[PDB]
Amino acid sequence: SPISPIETVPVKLKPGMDGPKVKQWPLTEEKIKALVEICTEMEKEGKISKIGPENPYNTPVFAIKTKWRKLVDFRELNKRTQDFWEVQLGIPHPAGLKKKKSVTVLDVGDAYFSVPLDEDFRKYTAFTIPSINNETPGIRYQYNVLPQGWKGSPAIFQSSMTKILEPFRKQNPDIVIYQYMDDLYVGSDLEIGQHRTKIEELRQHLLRWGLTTPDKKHQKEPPFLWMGYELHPDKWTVQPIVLPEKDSWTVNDIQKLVGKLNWASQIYPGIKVRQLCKLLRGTKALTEVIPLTEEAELELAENREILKEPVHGVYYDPSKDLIAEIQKQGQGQWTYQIYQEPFKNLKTGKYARMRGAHTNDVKQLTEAVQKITTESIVIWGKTPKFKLPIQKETWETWWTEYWQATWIPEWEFVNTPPLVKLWYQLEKEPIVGAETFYVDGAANRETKLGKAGYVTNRGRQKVVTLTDTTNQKTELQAIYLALQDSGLEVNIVTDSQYALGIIQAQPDQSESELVNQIIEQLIKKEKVYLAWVPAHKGIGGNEQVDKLVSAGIR
Amino acid sequence: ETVPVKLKPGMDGPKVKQWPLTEEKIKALVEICTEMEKEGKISKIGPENPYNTPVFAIKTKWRKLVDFRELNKRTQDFWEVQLGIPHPAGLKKKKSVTVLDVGDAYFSVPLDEDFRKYTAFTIPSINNETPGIRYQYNVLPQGWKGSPAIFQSSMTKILEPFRKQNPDIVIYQYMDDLYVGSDLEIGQHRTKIEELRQHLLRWGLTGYELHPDKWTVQPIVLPEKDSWTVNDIQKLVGKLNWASQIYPGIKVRQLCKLLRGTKALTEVIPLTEEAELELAENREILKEPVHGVYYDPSKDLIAEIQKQGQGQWTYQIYQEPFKNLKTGKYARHTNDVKQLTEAVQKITTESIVIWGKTPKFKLPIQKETWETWWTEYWQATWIPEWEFVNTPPLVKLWYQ
Numbered sequence: 001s002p003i004s005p006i007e008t009v010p011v012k013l014k015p016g017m018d019g020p021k022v023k024q025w026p027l028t029e030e031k032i033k034a035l036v037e038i039c040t041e042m043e044k045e046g047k048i049s050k051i052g053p054e055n056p057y058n059t060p061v062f063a064i065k066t067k068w069r070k071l072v073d074f075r076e077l078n079k080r081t082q083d084f085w086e087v088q089l090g091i092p093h094p095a096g097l098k099k100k101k102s103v104t105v106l107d108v109g110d111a112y113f114s115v116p117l118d119e120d121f122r123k124y125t126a127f128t129i130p131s132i133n134n135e136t137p138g139i140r141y142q143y144n145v146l147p148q149g150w151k152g153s154p155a156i157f158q159s160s161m162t163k164i165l166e167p168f169r170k171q172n173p174d175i176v177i178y179q180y181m182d183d184l185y186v187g188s189d190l191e192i193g194q195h196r197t198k199i200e201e202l203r204q205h206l207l208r209w210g211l212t213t214p215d216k217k218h219q220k221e222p223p224f225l226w227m228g229y230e231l232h233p234d235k236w237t238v239q240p241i242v243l244p245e246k247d248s249w250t251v252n253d254i255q256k257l258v259g260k261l262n263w264a265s266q267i268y269p270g271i272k273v274r275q276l277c278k279l280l281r282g283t284k285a286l287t288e289v290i291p292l293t294e295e296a297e298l299e300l301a302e303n304r305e306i307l308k309e310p311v312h313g314v315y316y317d318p319s320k321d322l323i324a325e326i327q328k329q330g331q332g333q334w335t336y337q338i339y340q341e342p343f344k345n346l347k348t349g350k351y352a353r354m355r356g357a358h359t360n361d362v363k364q365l366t367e368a369v370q371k372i373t374t375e376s377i378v379i380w381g382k383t384p385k386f387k388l389p390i391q392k393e394t395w396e397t398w399w400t401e402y403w404q405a406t407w408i409p410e411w412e413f414v415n416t417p418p419l420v421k422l423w424y425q426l427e428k429e430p431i432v433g434a435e436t437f438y439v440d441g442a443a444n445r446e447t448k449l450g451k452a453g454y455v456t457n458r459g460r461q462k463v464v465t466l467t468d469t470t471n472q473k474t475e476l477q478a479i480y481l482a483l484q485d486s487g488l489e490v491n492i493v494t495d496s497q498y499a500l501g502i503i504q505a506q507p508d509q510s511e512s513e514l515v516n517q518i519i520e521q522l523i524k525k526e527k528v529y530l531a532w533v534p535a536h537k538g539i540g541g542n543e544q545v546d547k548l549v550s551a552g553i554r
Numbered sequence: 555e556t557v558p559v560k561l562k563p564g565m566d567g568p569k570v571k572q573w574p575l576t577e578e579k580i581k582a583l584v585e586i587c588t589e590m591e592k593e594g595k596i597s598k599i600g601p602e603n604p605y606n607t608p609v610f611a612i613k614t615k616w617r618k619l620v621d622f623r624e625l626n627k628r629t630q631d632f633w634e635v636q637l638g639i640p641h642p643a644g645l646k647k648k649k650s651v652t653v654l655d656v657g658d659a660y661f662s663v664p665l666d667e668d669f670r671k672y673t674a675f676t677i678p679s680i681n682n683e684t685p686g687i688r689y690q691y692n693v694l695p696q697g698w699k700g701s702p703a704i705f706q707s708s709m710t711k712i713l714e715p716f717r718k719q720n721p722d723i724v725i726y727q728y729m730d731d732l733y734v735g736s737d738l739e740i741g742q743h744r745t746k747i748e749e750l751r752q753h754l755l756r757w758g759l760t761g762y763e764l765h766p767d768k769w770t771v772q773p774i775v776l777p778e779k780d781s782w783t784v785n786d787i788q789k790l791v792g793k794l795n796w797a798s799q800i801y802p803g804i805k806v807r808q809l810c811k812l813l814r815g816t817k818a819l820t821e822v823i824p825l826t827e828e829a830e831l832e833l834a835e836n837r838e839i840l841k842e843p844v845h846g847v848y849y850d851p852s853k854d855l856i857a858e859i860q861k862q863g864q865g866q867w868t869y870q871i872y873q874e875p876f877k878n879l880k881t882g883k884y885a886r887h888t889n890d891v892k893q894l895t896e897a898v899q900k901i902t903t904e905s906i907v908i909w910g911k912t913p914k915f916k917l918p919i920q921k922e923t924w925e926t927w928w929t930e931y932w933q934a935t936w937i938p939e940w941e942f943v944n945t946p947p948l949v950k951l952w953y954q
């Protein structure tokens with residue numbers, strides 16, 4: 001196997017550090033013999049070189065078994081080697097691959113060993129094959145090439161492969177080369193003949209640099225099986241997904257199931273995982289069987305049906321625009337598809353999120369648009385045109401009145417129910433001939449006890465007691481009280497910026513049952529006006545409900 | 555000969571992740587960097603450099619913007635203590651201030667060989683097809699606060715004749731820009747700028763017109779009403795109560811007196827007009843500056859922005875919450891993200907003019923939305939620091 005004529009990468013140790021000086025532990029006679037055979041072969045191949053006792057460094061070596069293999073423990077050297085540039089930002093996604101007439105995969109044989117190591121660093125890769133029962137000095141060696149398990153090997157290899165392909169890429173601009181680990185994905189729109197001829201031209205360019213690739217007979221042909229994907233010449237999909245039929249499901253079985261479903265969600269639309277995820281709460285043991293809920297059984301059944309018949313995705317055409325469609329799937333669940341030619345998907349996906357405690361479908365939809373946009377820039381270098389299940393008027397109303405800067409790139413409405421809407425809207429000015437509730441909530445920090453109540457301009461009053469509450473919970477209870485005993489038109493005056501803040505963002509869903517109870521009241525109402533006043537400043541109305549809730553509390 | 559750049563102890567270079575870029579932005583950066591490398595300005599680097607600084611492309615002509623916010627924080631002692639550029643207090647007093655890009659100056663001056671690694675940046679690729687293109691600077695980079703600091707002596711020699719001939723003209727350098735202020739008639743000022751461009755042209759160096767003397771406060775506006783409801787007085791007390799934490803001497807006792815018992819919101823309650831004394835006195839305080847607030851050069855500046863709707867935005871600048879040094883507004887096919895970047899840039903510019911430093915922003919937007927779209931409209935060669943906040947419901951109306 002060749003050792004490439006490339007200029008080596010200058011490697012250093014971390015500032016203020018010396019190389020490893022880790023003692024070699026006495027090994028068995030069989031282990032020593034096996035290491036001697038391995039090392040003399042590696043030395044004959046130029047991979048390692050004998051050293052003198054002058055070199056004070058050492059890293060432990062081990063052997064494991066029909067055929068014995070050498071294991072170098074570089075834990076110490078790794079902890080002392082400098083940091084390197086992170087190889088990649090991410091992995092290539094199949095949907096991002098341009099469609100090519102002819103494609104072939106070239107793996108690099110004994111990749112790391114085919115790249116030389118910086119002469120000034122070789123010194124620190126020192127290891128010893130111990131003598132029988134550690135009597136005589138051991139056999140000492142050091143690496144000449146990039147060693148397996150050492151920190152700089154992935155980075156220096158990739159950088160060497162980049163420098164090597166650089167001329168070839170220039171003298172062949174109509175050929176795409178994808179670099180991932182010890183692999184090369186080579187594609188062109190050439191008819192097979194001149195393509196397999198261009199591959200051999202690349203193989204030969206690689207050999208001039210000490211890099212071996214397999215010949216026509218051994219090199220990989222489509223369908224490619226890579227990173228859980230099936231890559232065909234004109235389509236792609238995820239590797240066969242099978243959902244096990246089980247009497248009892250353990251935490252581990254549900255974990256394995258969620259992962260498979262999430263992996264399948266990249267090309268199969270509709271996949272849901274909410275009910276199955278909810279089961280995994282509670283910190284139970286891996287072997288602990290989790291009984292399914294009606295909803296989880298219902299979710300699993302729908303997923304089985306989606307996965308019943310196989311689905312594939314297409315490749316990218318850089319001339320055509322990208323289109324992204326989104327659908328509300330249910331409570332906090334969103335689904336999307338990205339295509340160029342109507343309903344021939346490049347990929348799919350899902351969005352589910354709790355970006356806070358109280359939210360609404362309009363906020364959820366902007367979050368999904370943002371996530372999809374980011375993903376498009378990463379995979380294709382351009383943003384998609386959105387088709388949203390929200391009217392332009394609903395969007396215009398929301399963004400115009402919201403406190404936050406909110407933006408959605410060019411989009412179009414699509415009548416795909418359920419449609420995204422606001423379920424209620426607060427009044428802009430006080431209501432004439434509607435009752436004015438002055439609400440308040442207070443809670444004793446020492447007892448956790450509290451009172452929630454209201455005083456009106458129509459004589460009405462009420463005070464309710466709560467036992468394991470907070471100031472926040474009593475302030476929300478006070479609003480709920482006023483919404484319960486008020487009728488279809490009401491004005492509410494609070495001293496709580498917290499409750500004002502929540503209600504003003506028009507939430508339709510919350511992690512709080514209290515907020516959800518408030519929401520169902522706000523929807524049923526015809527007109528609601530909420531207003532704020534400073535607390536304990538002697539404001540009329542607020543002063544009267546203050547003394548009331550403070551009785552036996554604060 | 556290069557000036558040795560010594561990093562702050564205990565902390566080392568930036569390791570900031572590169573943001574995904576669009577095809578057009580990547581292509582533009584490749585052309586720019588291929589040209590800079592041919593000129594010796596930048597050099598390709600290996601994997602043995604673990605450092606990284608984000609890079610972007612802004613605007614017909616595409617230009618390279620390197621985000622050195624991290625490297626700058628890690629070199630604070632060099633450009634601020636060791637080689638500080640004094641900020642003139644007279645600059646904000648000028649009738650006209652013209653901003654000139656002088657960043658092209660830096661590519662003539664080489665950078666210390668042992669500091670070059672800290673300037674590492676990556677040109678990303680689409681769908682991670684290929685490993686990103688890595689480079690480092692050989693010359694003083696645009697966006698590095700260290701560059702105007704090192705270049706200070708050269709810049710002084712360049713400007714010496716112009717300054718000597720025009721003593722009433724203030725020239726301030728902040729990052730890649732020159733701030734030129736005068737009290738001259740606009741035609742004479744524009745003529746003196748042109749003259750300075752010529753002096754700069756003789757050293758290889760090559761618009762934006764501000765009027766600082768015309769910079770006034772946004773007083774907390776109190777309504778003028780013929781008829782006042784319970785709700786109007788409630789809204790008024792809240793605004794004043796809040797203003798009493800900032801402004802020394804704000805009264806509310808008399809206005810509060812009107813609000814007695816559980817009265818209806820729409821109920822018109824004619825004013826005592828004895829309380830009007832407070833209204834008037836408060837109005838007089840609010841139009842004048844805040845007594846007792848002073849710029850502290852050791853503390854950082856904070857700028858908060860609120861969306862007011864109809865293309866209007868309000869902002870406040872302070873060091874200690876509620877101790878406003880300056881307040882103001884910003885008004886406008888323009889979207890929220892476009893308007894917010896415009897407001898951030900206008901506030902930053904005013905901040906450099908008044909204090910010689912950029913503020914740390916509290917932006918009422920989603921981190922992700924902002925990060926995806928801010929470069930689409932960004933035109934400045936500097937980037938201020940920023941945080942993402944959830945604007946309190948009442949701070950908007952208190953500044954309305």
Ligand SMILES: O=C(CCc1ncccn1)Nc1cc(-c2ccc3c(c2)CCCC3)n[nH]1
Binds near residue numbers: 105180184220221225
């Ligand atoms: O083809 C096979 C499996 C063959 C097989 N196994 C078993 C049975 C029958 N056939 N392996 C394979 C595929 C790839 C590959 C595919 C795509 C891409 C890259 C690499 C690099 C990034 C870009 C896209 N590498 N090695």
